[PDB]
Design a protein around this ligand. Structure first.
Ligand code: CDL
Ligand code: 3PE
Ligand code: 3PE
Ligand code: 3PE
Ligand code: 3PE
Ligand code: 3PE
Ligand code: LMT
Ligand code: LMT
Ligand code: GTP
Ligand code: MG
Lengths: 347, 97, 63, 174, 56, 112, 97, 140, 320
């Protein structure tokens, strides 16, 4: 891939997301989704190996099916309303189809099976796009149709995502599958608060993106994709292990780290609506996420695993990866709890 | 609703179940995807034509344009799947288990 | 500090806390009414903008 | 009987879908999809969309022609499967036709049928517009407005088609 | 006595930690097959409508 | 306003002081980012690239100032809406007739 | 939209196609033009929570125009009765019907 | 589920146990079938019989748990003349947990199932007595 | 402007700098076969960059002040210790072999970077493509376990795939009895313990595995001891070669842009030389690892990224 071609394709991925976000017409929203899927597959196939081919095919089949259900909902909405405006849907069957269509696009459980596999099959840079940028467009549509979403359906997906994400991460030794299951679990929190306060869905989304972007950027820096490969970081870049520790604890929602904020704010919103059993269940089940974050901090930062002799050759060479924005993202990933009231800007 | 909608809606459902219930050939599933667009095209056209909403008469055309892109995208992936395993069978796409 | 400074400093703290505590209860009651009745700035989900309608004479009379 | 023209076409429409949804050899799946495109064009034509109908037929005829070529190269086996050659294909094919027949039988037996949702079986002509004396096609004016009104739609569609060429070449350059 | 057996075996960190291991294995021990994942999408939609009436 | 970071009506509010404690914290966060940047690239943490360190602080404070202004404005808006709604619906916010503890009754629970 | 850049910049990218009461080529009106306009003008500015309740009449009439469900039920009632009376030798249609 | 759940709550507690048990048995069987559908879809049986034999065990295990829960919870209230007692569901929950352990051949599961199912059921009874909402309507 | 996609977009493409003198030549042959002397002559006559064979301290010469570092900063791998006790218990034999391969891999990247960046050809003495000959001889002599051989194949399998083979392979073919004689004359005491069986295993590995593979994709020139004497004859053959096979014919700008992006980042090059496969020979524990690593950073001009060490005269650090 010619560098100019990569930029144009990369700009098209953003263009499709932006089209969804600025569109007031259901057709243009669907077009934006198609444009996004068209441009992301070549990024997935960038390295041209059988695994990347499998991931791209599994991704394409899933996203195509969601687009069909989404467009079906739009046409049903047109029959029962005669209009195309992006807003609440006027038919409950259309609401179900759109909600499920967006659930597949996000990778929410039980439409989650593709997220672990696609993420594992593609490079880290592509996985970063998949688990962060690709969340924006479906969430922005959910942010506009939520008044007509069936409450039981959306909360059922949120609960299942948190459980399935929590349990799925416990068995993983690959860093890309850990980030996939962690992503599934975090998506559950975003949609659980969606019916009550959409602002806290945006807050959780932004903070999830900052923390996920930081973790992928640190994995890219040392070119690590397994738990054991990451366990050598202490012997080359000690500073990196400390940043991984702080970021991982934040992702686990431990105060006083930034990652505690979205969980804190979502519990507040749910209790204000006399929803007590669900936030309690959610917070406890999120302890599964913390458990398999803590294993990574054990093998990465708090202990020292054995090295290999050839590691000494890497002591003589500096990191040359861009690590774009890493110093800023890690500070935002960890030291933002004192600034929590700034969430009103999202209002 | 009008009785035509019963069969067009049924047609969409048949292709949806067609897509979700795979066999071996990945090509067969790509046809069920083009089947869903065909029914979506037809059902959109009936609604738009019957209601005399002129400006959306271009909507079904745009629908076909982005169906062609998906089919071209789907066929491209089938080429690379076939070049790897020598068939388009979907059971070969299980490295990532 | 003398007992007087800390005493009246405490009163100034209690006033601020009491005022905030009242507004917190008022807001939860305003949010409850606004959401139920939709007659306020909050929970104002958009309708279709009427300036998009065409009021010109059409190709046929009855419409 | 002729008043039910659109319904009769829609019955063949579903039957074509059962043809390729049962998923026999893609040679026959393509045939099923060509038929559905044909009577699908007929359905849209009978609602006043001659241009829309003929084009979906034209586009799908070229698409299945590419599919036929790809089937002989990448989706062919020694014994291509017909609807009668496989129990799973025949079972799906039979199931879809019986589910189609019964829906037809009740809606014709009663002039209404309930299949999850209420459908009226009075014939599709009853919903048509009564008056019409404009000296033009409404579909043509609506479609032709893509170039005056649909400036934004042309940009996004033109870009996507251009990117589609770039993308397919990246994907297929192993 | 048997009563404390329930109050222990059920609340043991081993019990809690070992049930999470079963659930983890059930979730993650998949075949990686497109056919099986999409067959489950079909079941999710059917029970969503027939059993929970999410479309109503 | 629609899709505006700071609508014109926001200029009636007193801007954040340049010595705001929240703005000082933001500036500190830029300092930490500047130090981490030296660390990950393996330069002398406190000394290296003071030009780079000044830009981390300046950019954080620049962005933080506008975020704090929007933050303040959105809370002023929330109060403006809440108070006007209370004005518009007197029947839903009636003054409580306030008894004194001499008149009110509370059951006493001995701590024996 | 999520980001209303169209209103901010004043450009009009897709609002033109959103409703069937908008300006059409050569002023061809949609079949339900009057019903849409009434519902859009009833609910303008008051929000969906209020509009769901205070514009049911306008919406209910608009829905009747779109899908004609009440009308077709009425016709099926009349047609069904005529079958009963024609088949019983009770009523005879006039020449023009 | 909505209608089937309603009828269970429709009839008074501690009375008409045959009907209560029919409700819980129906809730048990439906849960077993749902587990059977996902199980067979994602873990393909070797033969069509073993797919039916797997549906047979899960559906029967789930239906047995519900039937025993409904029976024990109703009879316990009937004996004790305490309809709205949370403790009645505690006994129903443990009996169900025992059925799972008996059906599973493992004293480890039977004990753990007793505790967790016992506490869960009592919370359910507490929930509708006190009006707790699991999926709460947005109100503020 | 450090090389990257932007520099490429602005017109820094490999095709603009290559010629028919932009070749990658490798000189091969058994021990004491005259490789290094021949290699220098070829480079001098063709105006190519000569790379002395990569040893235990090759990486040292490319970083810092260029001097060899103390051997604790190389795992204490010792060539002399290999010749004295080839079966030592501490795994010196394979630890040396694994270190040497990674040294050659690093050198090959440095050679390719020079070729692509400047267009000047290079000459190497052996390479990653022929390093396996010593692996094969070591194992056939029982100097390493079968587990070590599998490890080596794993590292080579994920590293040698990303590069292009040399344009020309020169092979000085000296019979084993002659090598055993030349080693005696040389005077190295440790080297004199090399057995004939070991040397016959290197010759067998070369003549049986290396040259047939290189024939299918490189211009392979072979010479006797007497032909190798006159580098003028060798240069004459090279200057009249065809170059009608091998992957170099299928390379274009975007492919060489990708290759250059790899070989200029040395950590990316060395990534898989340290795969977490815990062989006893190459594994090191935290206490030893941590202790040596802290020593490494105390070395002169080694605590900070090059250019940021005041203890070696670097200035303007507060503006860098
Ligand atoms: C509006 C109305 C709705 C509109 C739709 C109406 C239907 C119209 C037809 C549409 C086309 C359907 C396409 C079907 C298809 O492609 O199947 C391919 C699929 C795979 O084909 P294959 O690659 O040739 O494999 C053949 C063997 O089955 C390979 O399996 P095996 O070799 O391993 O043999 C052992 C077998 C044995 O299976 C079992 O374990 C027994 C399980 C019994 C559970 C009780 O294992 C299985 O296959 C397990 C599959 C069980 C399915 C899950 C059911 C729960 O075949 C099937 O699974 C059989 C289905 C055929 C009948 C379809 C019925 C259509 C209605 C579906 C429900 C619609 C609800 C709405
Ligand atoms: C104020 C409001 C906000 C409140 C939230 C909490 C704020 C803290 C958030 C921290 C954000 C991450 C930034 C942490 C900076 C860590 C700096 C450090 O520890 O020193 C790095 C040191 C480097 O070692 P060296 O080889 O000598 O130098 C190489 C780099 N030039 O590394 C090492 O050598 C250490 C290697 C051993 C690993 C030790 C691990 C245990 C100690 C970790 C301490 C940091 C814990 C951070 C976790 C969050 C704590 C709240
Ligand atoms: C974070 C500092 C505490 C460090 C230990 C970490 C504790 C865990 C953090 C978890 C979140 C709890 C945060 C609690 C602090 C926020 C509550 C608060 O203080 O809000 C009011 C504060 C202004 O404080 P005020 O009472 O008005 O007094 C002004 C005096 N000039 O307005 C604010 O919101 C400002 C809060 C930012 C922190 C104070 C900033 C002081 C100004 C200098 C900049 C900070 C530089 C030093 C960095 C210290 C990092 C440890
Ligand atoms: C008021 C400050 C309160 C701090 C509260 C801390 C809250 C937690 C903040 C988390 C972020 C921590 C910063 C990010 C990590 C950077 C530090 C690091 O990576 O490791 C420590 C490092 C020493 O490693 P080294 O390789 O030797 O660098 C050369 C420095 N001489 O660098 C160090 O030497 C230690 C760096 C931390 C100490 C900061 C010192 C404050 C600035 C002092 C001004 C400079 C004074 C110069 C004095 C000399 C002239 C007299
Ligand atoms: C939520 C409340 C908290 C609010 C937080 C606010 C977050 C947003 C604020 C921006 C965060 C990023 C700040 C980056 C500061 C470091 C920039 C720097 O010093 O660069 C030095 C040099 C390039 O500098 P130069 O490009 O010449 O500056 C002109 C820019 N047009 O080249 C270098 O060596 C820099 C390399 C290190 C930087 C990492 C790579 C990023 C490259 C950025 C390019 C320059 C960005 C200019 C920043 C201006 C911001 C106003
Ligand atoms: C939207 C509304 C949908 C509601 C239904 C949600 C259920 C979705 C669950 C899908 C993901 C579950 C994945 C999983 O846990 O594994 C599949 C599991 C197969 O495991 P199984 O055969 O039952 O046990 C073998 C013991 N050796 O199969 C199962 O038994 C899981 C059954 C879970 C159903 C509850
Ligand atoms: C995943 C498979 C997807 C398959 C899609 C199949 C086609 C789906 C058709 C969707 C439209 C069905 O529409 C459904 O039935 C009729 C339509 O008049 C409505 O019928 C009901 O609602 C309206 C509401 O005013 C009233 O007439 C009345 O309350 C009742 O008759 C339902 O409220 C509607 O939800
Ligand atoms: C009250 C709520 C408390 C919430 C606490 C947060 C829950 C976190 C759950 C983590 C569970 C996963 O942790 C996992 O548990 C099993 C328990 O069998 C351990 O299993 C361990 O003992 C079992 C047998 O007893 C062995 O088969 C296994 O080899 C051994 O590792 C795993 O070593 C551990 O990795
Ligand atoms: N085990 C091992 N020894 C090696 C390797 N490369 C070189 N050596 C040894 O390092 C010493 C120098 O290598 P040579 O160049 O082949 O010997 P030489 O004396 O220089 O002979 P010339 O070809 O003329 O240069 C010899 O003892 C080699 O056995 C290697 O990859 N593995
Ligand atoms: Mg030599």
């Amino acid at each position: 891939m010619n560098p100019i071609i990569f930029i144009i394709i990369l700009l098209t991925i953003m263009l499709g997301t932006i089209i969804v976000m600025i569109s007031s017409h259901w057709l243009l929203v669907w077009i934006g989704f198609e444009m996004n899927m068209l441009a992301i597959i070549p990024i997935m196939m960038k390295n041209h190996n059988p695994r990347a081919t499998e991931a791209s095919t599994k991704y394409f089949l899933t996203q195509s099916t969601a687009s069909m259900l989404l467009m079906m909902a739009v046409i049903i909405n047109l029959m029962f309303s005669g209009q195309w405006t992006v807003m609440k849907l006027f038919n409950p069957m259309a609401s179900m189809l759109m909600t499920m269509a967006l659930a597949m696009k996000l990778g929410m459980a039980p439409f989650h099976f593709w997220v672990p596999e696609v993420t594992q099959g593609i490079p880290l840079s592509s996985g970063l796009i998949l688990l962060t940028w690709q969340k924006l467009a479906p969430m922005s549509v959910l942010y506009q149709i939520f008044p007509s979403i069936n409450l039981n359906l959306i909360l059922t997906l949120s609960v299942l995502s948190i459980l399935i994400g929590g349990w799925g991460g416990l068995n993983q030794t690959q860093l890309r599958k850990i980030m996939a299951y962690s992503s599934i679990a975090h998506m559950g929190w975003m949609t659980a608060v969606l019916p009550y306060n959409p602002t806290m869905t945006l807050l959780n989304l932004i903070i999830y993106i900052i923390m996920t972007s930081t973790m992928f950027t640190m994995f890219m820096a040392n070119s690590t994709t397994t738990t054991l490969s990451l366990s050598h970081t202490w012997n080359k870049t000690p500073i990196m292990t400390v940043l991984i520790l702080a970021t991982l604890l934040s992702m686990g929602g431990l105060p006083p780290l930034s990652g505690f904020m979205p969980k804190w704010m979502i519990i507040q919103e749910m209790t204000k609506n006399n929803s007590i059993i669900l936030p309690t269940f959610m917070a406890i089940t999120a302890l599964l996420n913390l458990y398999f974050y803590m294993r990574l901090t054990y093998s990465t930062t708090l202990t020292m695993f054995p090295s290999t002799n050839n590691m000494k050759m890497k002591w003589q060479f500096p990191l040359m990866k861009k690590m774009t924005f890493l110093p800023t993202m890690v500070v935002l990933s960890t030291m933002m709890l004192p600034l929590t009231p700034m969430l009103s800007v999202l209002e | 609703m009008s009785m035509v909608y019963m069969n067009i809606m049924m047609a969409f459902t048949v292709s949806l179940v067609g897509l979700l219930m795979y066999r071996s050939h990945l090509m067969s599933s790509l046809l069920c995807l083009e089947g869903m667009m065909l029914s979506l095209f037809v059902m959109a056209a009936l609604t738009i034509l019957n209601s005399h909403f002129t400006l959306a008469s271009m909507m079904p055309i745009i629908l076909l344009v982005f169906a062609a892109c998906e089919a071209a995208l789907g066929l491209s992936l089938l080429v690379m799947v076939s070049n790897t395993y020598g068939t388009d069978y979907v059971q070969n796409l299980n490295l990532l288990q | 500090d003398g007992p007087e400074k800390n005493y009246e400093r405490t009163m100034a703290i209690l006033q601020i806390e009491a005022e905030k505590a009242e507004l917190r209860l008022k807001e939860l009651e305003v949010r409850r009414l606004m959401r139920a009745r939709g007659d306020g700035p909050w929970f104002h989900y958009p309708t279709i903008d009427k300036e998009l309608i065409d009021h010109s004479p059409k190709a046929t009379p009855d419409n | 009987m002729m008043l039910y023209i659109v319904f009769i076409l829609s019955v063949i429409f579903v039957m074509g879908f059962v043809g390729f949804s049962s998923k026999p050899s893609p040679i026959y799946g393509g045939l099923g999809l060509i038929v559905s495109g044909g009577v699908g064009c007929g359905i849209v034509l009978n609602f006043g969309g001659s241009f829309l109908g003929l084009m979906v037929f034209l586009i799908y005829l070229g698409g299945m022609m590419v599919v036929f070529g790809y089937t002989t190269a990448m989706a062919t086996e020694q014994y291509p499967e017909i609807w009668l050659s496989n129990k799973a294909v025949l079972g799906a094919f039979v199931t879809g036709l019986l589910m189609e027949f019964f829906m037809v039988y009740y809606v014709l037996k009663d002039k209404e049928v309930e299949v999850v949702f209420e459908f009226n079986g009075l014939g599709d002509w009853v919903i048509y517009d009564t008056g019409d004396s404009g000296f033009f096609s409404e579909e043509a004016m609506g479609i032709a407005a893509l170039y005056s009104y649909g400036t934004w739609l042309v940009i996004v569609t033109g870009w996507s088609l251009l990117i589609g060429v770039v993308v397919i070449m990246e994907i297929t350059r192993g | 006595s048997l009563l404390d057996l329930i109050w222990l075996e059920a609340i043991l960190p081993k019990t809690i930690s070992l049930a999470q291991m079963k659930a983890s294995t059930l979730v993650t021990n998949q075949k990686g097959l497109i056919k099986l994942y999409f067959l489950s999408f079909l079941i999710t939609i059917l029970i969503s409508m027939i059993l929970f009436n999410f479309h109503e | 306003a629609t899709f505006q970071f700071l609508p014109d009506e926001a200029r009636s509010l007193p801007p954040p002081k340049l010595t705001d404690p929240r703005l000082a914290f933001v500036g500190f966060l830029g300092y930490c980012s500047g130090l981490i940047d030296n660390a990950i690239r393996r330069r002398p943490v406190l000394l290296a690239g003071l030009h780079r360190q000044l830009l981390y602080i300046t950019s954080f404070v620049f962005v933080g100032y506008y975020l704090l202004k929007r933050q303040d404005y959105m809370y002023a808006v929330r109060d403006h809406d809440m108070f006007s709604y209370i004005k518009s619906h007197p029947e839903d916010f009636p003054e409580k007739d306030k008894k004194t503890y001499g008149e009110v009754f509370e059951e006493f629970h001995p701590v024996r | 939209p999520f980001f209303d850049v169209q209103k901010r910049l004043g450009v009009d990218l897709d609002r033109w196609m959103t409703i069937q009461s908008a300006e059409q080529p050569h002023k061809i009106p949609s079949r339900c033009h009057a019903f849409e306009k009434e519902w859009i003008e009833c609910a303008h500015g008051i929000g969906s929570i209020r509009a769901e309740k205070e514009c049911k009449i306008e919406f209910e009439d608009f829905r009747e125009c779109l899908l004609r469900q009440k009308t077709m039920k009425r016709l099926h009632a009349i047609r069904r009765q005529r079958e009963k009376l024609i088949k019983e030798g009770k009523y005879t249609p006039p020449p023009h019907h | 589920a909505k209608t089937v759940l309603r009828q269970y709550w429709d009839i008074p507690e501690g009375t008409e146990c045959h009907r209560k048990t029919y409700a819980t048995t129906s809730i048990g069987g439906a849960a077993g079938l749902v587990v059977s559908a996902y199980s067979v879809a994602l873990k393909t049986p070797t033969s069509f019989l073993e797919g039916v034999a797997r549906t047979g065990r899960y559906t029967f295990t789930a239906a047995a748990i519900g039937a025993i829960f409904g029976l024990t919870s109703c009879i316990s209230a009937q004996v004790r003349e305490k309809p709205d007692d949370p403790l009645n569901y505690l006994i129903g929950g443990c009996a169900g947990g025992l059925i799972l352990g008996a059906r599973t051949r493992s004293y480890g599961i039977g004990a753990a199932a007793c505790a967790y199912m016992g506490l869960t059921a009592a919370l359910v009874k507490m929930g509708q007595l006190e009006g707790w909402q699991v999926f709460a309507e947005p109100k503020v | 402007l450090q090389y990257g996609p932007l520099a490429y977009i602005l017109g820094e493409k490999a095709t603009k700098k290559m010629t028919e003198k932009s070749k990658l030549i490798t000189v091969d042959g058994n021990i004491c076969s005259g490789k290094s002397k021949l290699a220098k002559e070829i480079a001098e006559k063709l105006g190519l960059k000569h790379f002395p064979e990569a040893g235990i301290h090759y990486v040292d010469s490319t970083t810092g002040d260029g001097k060899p570092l103390p051997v604790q900063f190389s795992g204490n791998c010792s060539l002399e210790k290999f010749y004295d006790d080839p079966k030592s218990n501490d795994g010196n034999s394979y630890r040396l072999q694994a270190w040497l391969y990674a040294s050659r891999l690093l050198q090959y990247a440095d050679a390719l970077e020079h070729l692509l960046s400047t267009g000047q050809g290079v000459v190497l003495e052996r390479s990653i493509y022929s390093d396996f000959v010593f692996l094969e001889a070591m194992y056939r002599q029982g100097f390493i376990r079968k587990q070590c051989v599998d490890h080596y194949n794993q590292v080579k399998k994920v590293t040698i795939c990303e590069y292009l083979p040399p344009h020309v392979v020169v092979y000085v073919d000296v019979p084993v009895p002659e090598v055993q004689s030349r080693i005696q004359k040389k005077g190295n005491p440790h080297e004199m313990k090399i057995t004939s069986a070991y040397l016959q295993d290197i010759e067998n590995a070369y003549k049986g595995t290396f040259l047939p593979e290189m024939s299918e994709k490189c211009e392979v020139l072979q010479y006797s001891a007497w032909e190798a004497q006159d580098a003028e004859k060798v240069v004459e053959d090279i200057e009249y070669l065809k170059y009608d096979k091998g992957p170099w014919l299928d390379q274009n700008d975007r492919k060489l842009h990708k290759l250059r992006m790899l070989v200029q980042d040395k950590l990316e090059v060395l990534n898989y030389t340290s795969i977490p496969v815990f062989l006893p020979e190459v594994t090191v524990g935290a206490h030893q690892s941590d202790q040596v690593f802290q020593e490494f950073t105390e070395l002169p001009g080694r605590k900070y990224r090059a250019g940021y060490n005041e203890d070696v005269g670097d200035k303007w650090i507060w503006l860098k």
